[PDB]
């Protein structure tokens with residue numbers, strides 16, 4: 001990596017001295033040394049990059065977003081200087097984009113990634129990085145165009161393949177997605193050994209009836225992406241007790257279960273009142289988890305945040321649930337009514353995280369036709385009774401009754417998570 | 429988009445720095 005232009009070679013002794021302070025962990029002294037070099041040599045790209053790298057380390061030491069914001073600007077400054085070597089220009093803007101993403105400055109990262117592609121139009125990896133930037137802002141359409149361009153010049157780029165396949169699968173182009181995800185994982189290219197691509201390749205195969213799916217789940221388990229073939233969540237705290245079905249006593253949340261079952265009819269009646277008088281509060285399921293049929297949800301809590309308008313529609317239910325922070329405070333779960341109609345089949349799937357358990361309270365359950373499989377075990381609901389499963393295990397639902405089926409879904413923190421972990425885990 | 433029942437998004441958590 002050639003990082004020194006003509007002038008920087010002449011001041012290499014000063015540049016090396018400041019960098020040695022950084023490598024020895026004397027970050028404060030290293031920042032001031034590179035700051036002095038920037039003051040004395042304001043056009044040196046290596047001095048500016050050293051300042052930015054030191055600010056980068058200082059932000060890690062202080063855990064300061066604001067210090068990192070200064071580093072992000074100094075990386076940009078490197079690129080504006082005259083006579084910047086190409087390798088240093090790429091490193092500086094790539095680190096700038098990376099740190100922008102870390103801070104959640106996704107639009108800024110996109111501008112930086114777009115500048116990189118304009119400056120280095122033949123660098124396929126930079127286009128791949130741009131595609132990631134679009135995916136992180138939710139722009140699947142522009143991401144798809146980026147990976148199409150990559151695959152036109154380098155058809156066997158495994159990173160582009162798995163990301164192109166991921167987008168196809170997200171767009172419900174299930175059969176089309178399989179060879180891209182498969183060949184991309186099989187390429188072994190850097191960035192392809194990723195649990196997300198194992199997860200969606202196996203799921204796409206299950207949706208088309210390809211029996212090879214579980215061979216890929218087994219390989220993902222053996223490579224450390226999944227806790228097991230059955231439990232395939234990717235946002236995990238390791239060591240939590242892993243079992244598909246739970247009893248109320250096993251969870252320890254017996255007071256919550258008792259209150260749900262003692263008061264189930266008020267929960268039912270408010271749900272029915274919304275069905276009859278405010279049905280627009282039930283929103284269609286929006287994660288492509290249905291093969292067919294009608295499934296809608298009316299959500300009272302999500303990410304540990306109460307929906308005030310939603311609670312106007314079920315005020316007694318919300319009042320009841322407020323006494324149980326084990327569910328209202330579960331920032332990796334929801335509290336919601338779930339209605340499912342006949343002719344509905346929910347694809348086998350897994351939730352995102354092993355940090356929650358999922359309670360189902362039966363509200364209106366037809367006598368026949370409704371059932372839920374979790375792992376290798378199938379059960380059914382009962383009116384006024386709570387079922388508890390770990391939805392990080394693969395589960396699947398059928399509705400073949402002659403009338404609607406209404407349940408109440410109550411997520412709780414995994415009972416073995418300490419209060420310290422329940423406070424510091426990012427919301428999902 | 430959020431990962432509520434499934435794992436369909438590229439990332440399920442928000443980027444917010446330290």
Ligand SMILES: O=C(O)CCC(=O)C(=O)O
Nearest residue numbers: 338339340391397409433
């Ligand atoms: O039966 C339902 O309403 C939803 C089933 C499901 O996939 C879940 O509760 O995670």
Ligand SMILES: [Cl-]
Nearest residue numbers: 041042043044
């Ligand atoms: Cl200068």
Ligand SMILES: [Cl-]
Nearest residue numbers: 279282296339
């Ligand atoms: Cl409905």
Ligand SMILES: [Fe+3]
Nearest residue numbers: 351391395433
């Ligand atoms: Fe589910």
